[PDB]
Amino acid sequence: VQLVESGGGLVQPGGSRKLSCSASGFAFSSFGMHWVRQAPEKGLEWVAYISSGSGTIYYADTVKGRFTISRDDPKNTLFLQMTSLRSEDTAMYYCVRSIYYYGSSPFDFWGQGTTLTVSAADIVMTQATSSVPVTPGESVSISCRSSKSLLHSNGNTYLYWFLQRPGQSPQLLIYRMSNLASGVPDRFSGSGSGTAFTLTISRLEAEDVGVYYCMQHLEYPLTFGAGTKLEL
Amino acid sequence: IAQARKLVQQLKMEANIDRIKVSKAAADLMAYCEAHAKEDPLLTPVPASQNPFR
Amino acid sequence: PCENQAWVFATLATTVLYCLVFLLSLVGNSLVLWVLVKYESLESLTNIFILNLCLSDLVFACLLPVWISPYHWGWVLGDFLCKLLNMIFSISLYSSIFFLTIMTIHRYLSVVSPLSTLRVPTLRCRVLVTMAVWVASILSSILDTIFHKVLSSGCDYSELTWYLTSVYQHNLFFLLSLGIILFCYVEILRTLFRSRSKRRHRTVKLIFAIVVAYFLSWGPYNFTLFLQTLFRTQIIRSCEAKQQLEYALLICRNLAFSHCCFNPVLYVFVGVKFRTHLKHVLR
Amino acid sequence: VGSEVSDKRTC
Amino acid sequence: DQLRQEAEQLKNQIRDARKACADATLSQITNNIDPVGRIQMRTRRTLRGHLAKIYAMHWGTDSRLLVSASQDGKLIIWDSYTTNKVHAIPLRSSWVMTCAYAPSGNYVACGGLDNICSIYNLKTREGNVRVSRELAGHTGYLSCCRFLDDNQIVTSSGDTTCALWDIETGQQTTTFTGHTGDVMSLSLAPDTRLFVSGACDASAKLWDVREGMCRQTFTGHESDINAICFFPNGNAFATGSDDATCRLFDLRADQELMTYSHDNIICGITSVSFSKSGRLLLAGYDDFNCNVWDALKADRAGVLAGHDNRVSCLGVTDDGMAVATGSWDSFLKIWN
Amino acid sequence: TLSAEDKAAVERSKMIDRNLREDGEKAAREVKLLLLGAGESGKNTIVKQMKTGIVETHFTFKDLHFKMFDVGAQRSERKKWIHCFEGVTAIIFCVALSDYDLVMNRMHASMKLFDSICNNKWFTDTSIILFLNKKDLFEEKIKKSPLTICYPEYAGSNTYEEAAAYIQCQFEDLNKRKDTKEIYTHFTCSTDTKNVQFVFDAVTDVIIKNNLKDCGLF
């Protein structure tokens, strides 16, 4: 399972460009796909979403109107056509897959990313602690706050946690505030209720350094957090 | 000699099984269905506060 | 001049047989709709045609009791409501006839060339043909709304020309439908006769009964309407003949409107599949 | 077409 | 023939031991117990989507997901709370008569007239359902399949044998022989140390999974045995036969306690299952409806008559909240 | 009412339903044919033409796909799994005309088997095609071996035509429900190769009758 994106570069303002992502190693036709971008020295931001069956497409109000998403199932490729690029569209776009059924693990695999440089009612998630001095071995608790109650009438609290190692792509840790992602060590535990959440690590190692992000999925648009650095 | 095999089973096993009386046996079945009766959602039906299937 | 001595008898006959037909059609079509919805699947052309014909008959029966009122105290509903109701009437009638014809064509296709029917068509085409039949009925009915007003004679066509046009259109549609039905059923019967078959007597009987019922329902009524459209143009001045023509029109109109209750018996429940499904439902 | 009502009198 | 006469002599001894232990009856003990009232169940969900007869179904351990097998060649994993289809697994052989759900929830199993049990992996890195292993080695059709854990399965076949498999190697760890007819139903004890099998020779046998020998043999029925179900305690089990008669056997007493037979029922019994407390005994029949039997007084206390054909599968959730019946009319129904 | 994840789950369920309907529509085009022949009744001969449990053969003829199910490898009880095959278009049955002499006589056993499946509970409205194969040897065997050794109640000559007609009449006489079921007797012609044509004609007749039944005209 790997996703490689092709495209990007230096584009003059007012121009157009198409980003392509090649997917191999999994059933592409059964997965929904997202575009998530990271501005230089800033947090994550949602762009677009295309579903399996191509029957539901959503965009963020920032890019709606000029950005278009599409998929080609027989060729296993994902497309994003951009028109009238502004100076706020300079970022490194990542491709995230997601499948939705009972017991699924959305936002499980992220791509490597392509750098794109140009010349020159939403739920808000608060992660106040931008940095924490840490030592290997101690327990670390990282919290994130919300504005609206993420506890639906079904009983699921739609909160997601991600890890971004230095020089790497975001990786899923906890989905729906309580369930661990596959391949994640058991020292990660998630809890919380209502609009306040926390993430606890029992024994920190040298491979847990990075930035922690909190995301909601109760309703679109999916808004990310601000990040919490965990340098040692 | 297919019956050779069949023979020993009925002897070694079937003949010698310590068997209890039907009364002791049945008392225990009646008692399970009394201790664990309240938590049965089809004998003592549950309040529409759960019917996870309302 | 002439007096319709038949008016006193016409009022009673309408107010009795219209009510009987309305009740029977309501119960029969509701039963058919329940049976089709609960058990059958909405992907085979037969089910779609049966459901749509039953819905048209149900709408016709629901609108039927309104026309009983003018016989007693005249029409006081209004100008626009009269146009809407008289449009619904024609919509239901023409849709019923067209769906009967299309269903007969489908039966002939299925029997004569079973392999073509074996390959189920796409879902897209079925909705296309259903909408085609409905839009054809809409086109045939749209003239009445804009070409028919409320006058001293209750609701009646403003000009005699549109009356002639509607009567002749009715006659032509009946003739074309009868031709298609006869051709398809004769072909089916000949195909069944060509090869030895088991219990072919039942199918022969039901084809003959269907053709006879359709003719008896829709032939004399149109012939009497054609006689009336000749008398109204005043080519024959026999006042005595009008007295018998009025009674004939009464009987034939009742016979023609009996179709909204006769159709479900001959097209749905006489078959064994729907009858067994109804038997399962009755429990 | 047959929804119209019978004429009580006619000429 | 000397040994043959000895065997008859021992059978006389076996009958004497059983009679000596029958000091009373279950019906003579529950004479003072309060009768169970009329159990009225209503259809909450109707799970549609199958295009042919439904032959088997099984509940998950979470009491929410269930898998159903139909003779169109499809396994569907439903979400009974919302009537959603999580998965639809296409089978290589459309003649499937059994299905199973792993206690963990990672695997489902199916089998039928092709004499192969197929194990499916539901949680893979990709998004599809993959065939993990195809267990072959049986010379007859497969009747029932039950999971012991994620690596061991037990299978009853129509070749008068039951078998124990190790999935990772695909071989038979233990083979059970001693039936004189086609094995039709199989039930696992709560401790997964013993299991009972009902065959076509009107006999039920208690096997030992770790040892591999027939501990006990039960008789009494007059026709084919089609269903078996362990009591929740684990010291009794109920059987269903083609002579319109259920029976409740006992392991510690090695005898039959009660028979559930009426006078207006002449059809066979396809499925038998218990409730959470053991007070009710659900049973499916060929006459298109299911009856609720009271296990302690043998008096009928409910009729479930929402189906249009023979009820072939019947299951109760692990918490006893719902009873789901599937019949040959291609519909599942969740009753509560 | 529903979250985004619930809506996507509903969309996935609705796509599963669409694929299921497409698969069912595709499968409805195929023709189901059971081949419940007798033992040593020339089943190899009848499966020789196509132009560890259930053995399935898929051949096409005149743009109609036939699926044939040979179930003779099952050694268990026929009653327990015989209901799995209700809904088949036809049941191809094969008997050996040259097994009248070879013996329990084979012909009588074939008669009991035919009576068992013709009067079965599930097969009231399922047509049965009967093949009378291995007729080449019968032509020379009837001259040396008279048919009276097996049929004392026979008053015919030793010619092949009369004996074959007697065998066919006796096989068809075992039918009981002669209102919704038909028997299509045919003698296997190796050179003429009309077996597939006969099966096609019988299946077409069954399809026509089923369509008349479904429309409501029956």
Could you outline the blueprint of secondary structure elements for this entry?
The complex is a heterohexamer of chains A (232), B (54), C (283), D (11), E (336) and F (218).
Chain A: E1 2-6, E2 9-11, E3 16-24, E4 32-38, E5 44-50, E6 57-59, E7 67-72, E8 77-83, E9 91-98, E10 109-110, E11 114-118, E12 125-126, E13 140-146, E14 159-164, E15 170-175, E16 179-180, E17 188-193, E18 196-201, E19 211-216, E20 228-229
Chain D: E1 9-10
Chain F: H1 4-27, E1 31-35, H2 43-47, E2 55-60, E3 65-70, H3 78-81, E4 90-96, H4 106-118, E5 127-133, H5 135-144, H6 160-173, E6 183-187, H7 195-215
Parallel strand pairs in F: 1-3, 1-4, 4-5, 5-6
Antiparallel strand pairs in F: 2-3
Q: Kindly provide the radius of gyration of chain A, computed on alpha-carbon positions and rounded to a whole number of angstroms.
A: 18 Å
Percent of residues in helices of chain F comes to 40-55%
**Strand and helix order of chain A:** EEEEEEEEEEEEEEEEEEEE
Major sheet strand order of chain F:
2-3-1-4-5-6
Total beta strands of chain A: 20
Superfamily at the CATH H level of chain F?
P-loop containing nucleotide triphosphate hydrolases
Shape category of chain A: globular
Helix-and-strand structural type of chain F: alpha/beta
CATH architecture of chain F: 3-Layer(aba) Sandwich
Give a quick account of the main beta sheet of chain F: strands, pairing sense, barrel closure. Answer: 6 strands, mixed
Number of helices of chain F: 7
Assign the structural class of chain A, choosing from mainly alpha, mainly beta, alpha/beta, alpha+beta, or little secondary structure.
mainly beta
Largest interface: B-E, 38 and 59 residues
First-to-last CA distance of chain A: 32 Å
CATH H-level superfamily of the largest domain in chain A: Immunoglobulins
Membrane topology (chain B): Lipid-anchor
GO molecular function, one term (chain B): G-protein beta-subunit binding
Protein name (chain B): Guanine nucleotide-binding protein G(I)/G(S)/G(O) subunit gamma-2
Family (chain B): Belongs to the G protein gamma family.
